[PDB]
Each structure stands twice: as C-alpha cells, then as structure tokens.
Amino acid sequence: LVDGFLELERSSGKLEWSAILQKMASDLGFSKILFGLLPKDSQDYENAFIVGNYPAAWREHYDRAGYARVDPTVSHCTQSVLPIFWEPSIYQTRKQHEFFEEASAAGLVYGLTMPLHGARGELGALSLSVEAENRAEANRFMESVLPTLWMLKDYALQSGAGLAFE
Amino acid sequence: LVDGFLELERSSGKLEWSAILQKMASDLGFSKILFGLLPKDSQDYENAFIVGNYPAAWREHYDRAGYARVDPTVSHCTQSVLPIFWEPSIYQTRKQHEFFEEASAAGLVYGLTMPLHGARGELGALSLSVEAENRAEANRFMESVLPTLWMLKDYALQSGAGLAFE
Numbered sequence A, B: 001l002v003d004g005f006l007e008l009e010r011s012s013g014k015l016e017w018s019a020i021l022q023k024m025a026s027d028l029g030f031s032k033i034l035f036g037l038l039p040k041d042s043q044d045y046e047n048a049f050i051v052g053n054y055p056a057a058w059r060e061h062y063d064r065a066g067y068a069r070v071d072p073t074v075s076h077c078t079q080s081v082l083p084i085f086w087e088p089s090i091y092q093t094r095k096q097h098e099f100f101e102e103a104s105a106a107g108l109v110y111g112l113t114m115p116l117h118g119a120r121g122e123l124g125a126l127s128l129s130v131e132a133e134n135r136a137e138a139n140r141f142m143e144s145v146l147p148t149l150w151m152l153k154d155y156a157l158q159s160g161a162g163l164a165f166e
C-alpha cells in the first residue's frame, strides 16, 4: 500500500496516477473504481475531478440524468466519513430505484463508497465495485479487505488532491 | 470496532463516551489518548472539544504555553489526512524541542497523531501514546495495529463530532 502511495507521488500526469490507483484496486480484488473530488464549497458534480474505469457511457448518463442529486452515496458523503455499502436498503426513492437498475446494467451492483474529506475542505468519494456470485460473497470479500481500503482511501485523497488542485 | 462505535453512539454524555473511547484505545495497546475537535473555521485551540486521559497538568501546560502554535502535529493536521508519527525528526524548531522534552516528561514520548477532517468541516486530531521500553519497540507495535487505528479514528470522528457540536 505504502509503496503504491509513493508510486502515486512519483507519477506524472493524470493518466499515470489513474493507472496506478486502478492497479492498486485491482490487486486488492476490486474491478471498477471511481475517484471523484471537488474543491472546498463546490457542488459542481458535473465538473468534479474524476479518475477511474467506470464505463464511459455510464459516466455520461450519470451527468445527463443529474444523478448526483439522486445517488444515495452522494448525500451520505456530505454527512459522513464512514463507508456506505451498496446494499438494497440505501435505494429508497423512485429515482434511487431507477439509479440502482441503471447502475446494475452498467455492471456496478456490488460495492462500496468511501467518503473523502480533505485537509483543505476537498469533498469527494472513492467508489469501488466488486464482481461476485451474490451479495453475500461480495460482502465477505469487502469485509476481508476493508482495513486496507480504509487506509488506501486516505492515501488516495492526500495524493489526488495535489493532482487535482495544482 | 464496529461494536465499539455502536457503544459510542448509544452512550449518554461526554463521560461515558470518553470511557468507551479510552477503553477501545487501551484494548488495542495504547495507554493515553487525546481526541480533539474544532468546529468549521475555528482556530480557537484553547476552546477545542477535548476527550481523553492525558495528564491534566500537561493539558493545562499546553494551553498556557500556547503549544498549539508549536506542536508539529497541529500544522500537519491542517495539511494532511495521513498519520504523523512522533519521531524526533518532526521536532525542528527550538520551541519544538522544548515541546518534545516537556511532553516526554508527561509520559508522552512514543505515539502518533491521526488528523481528523469531518464532513461538516470539523478539524481535529486523535493522538495516541504507547507505553514502551523504547522507540524501536513502540514503532513495531504501532505498525502492527495501524490498520485498526486508521478505521478507529474515523469512527471516533463520526461519533465525536455529533457529541461535540450537534
């Protein structure tokens, strides 16, 4: 992990930094990731610094549909530093049910979101999806790597904020 | 931990919350802790929300000496989400060397500080000291529990910011 952080901090450009983070996540056993960050006091989700390997058409759809206002992980991240797991119980409204269906069609069904709150008031999220047979298999896998992920999200924040905002 | 967080969340009052947090830290191997928190935009360290079992006379000395302006972990917390270990190299200035000697006289020599950055702009620290026979032993110990501490500091923040300011 630490060696990954140092690779990130010796990277040059967004592409390489993204490559490194994606590989860290893959090596931990996640398949798709999205790292997003906004500067202090922005709610301009449509212009967030976004890194990762979510399907492009899914990212486009999310922006067009204004899903930042629906996605239950977004409001969660504005209120908490703790992880939110992608459990059925987080999708409550009608729009949130539509979101779950559309994300699932994108292959994003099992996963979690770690909120990011930076030392300079950056607001973000590190979302990570996992391929599994069922939700129970996914949840066992996630619980097994959670301590590593918990450290990773802060390493990714510290490094990524520098990249994003300078 | 999660059960520990749930206890914190069910607790009534600062006394019970502090006891639970102190017990969690003690159980992990740390004998003295300080959890400190300031609300959004405050730099009023003399009036921070403070929990823990540092010696009273040390807390009083820190406040009277204005050590929040000296303590290298404070500047670090304003710049980072990553831990800072209490290594001799972090004490650079003359006043910082005095700080190191005075803390060590309080029994606070080996340890680390986890920066706290809350979802509503809260700024703080969770500082933990370890009773060890020497720094090398202390560092072996802290490395061995770091991933648990890294989750703990966020549970403490999430719970403690509510206790402090809600």
Ligand SMILES: O=C(NCc1cc(Br)cc(Br)c1OC(=O)c1ccccc1[N+](=O)[O-])c1ccccc1[N+](=O)[O-]
Residues within 6 Å of the ligand: A034, A035, A036, A037, A038, A045, A046, A048, A049, A054, A058, A059, A062, A068, A071, A073, A074, A077, A086, A103, A108, A113, A123, A124, A125, A127
């Ligand atoms: O990853 C999920 N949500 C976060 C997210 C996805 C997309 Br696509 C685009 C954005 Br913008 C996005 O939101 C963020 O990254 C975000 C979230 C919170 C704060 C700040 C940011 N920020 O800086 O922009 C998600 C969560 C649960 C289930 C499915 C998904 N999903 O998108 O497939």
Ligand SMILES: O=C(NCc1cc(Br)cc(Br)c1OC(=O)c1ccccc1[N+](=O)[O-])c1ccccc1[N+](=O)[O-]
Residues within 6 Å of the ligand: B034, B035, B036, B037, B038, B045, B046, B048, B049, B054, B058, B059, B062, B068, B071, B073, B074, B077, B078, B086, B103, B108, B113, B123, B124, B125, B127
């Ligand atoms: O614990 C250390 N520093 C933090 C600290 C100690 C005392 Br006593 C009083 C305060 Br105020 C304090 O500062 C904080 O808690 C703090 C730190 C950063 C941001 C916000 C806060 N905030 O909200 O108060 C420390 C660090 C390294 C070595 C020794 C020590 N030590 O004090 O024994």
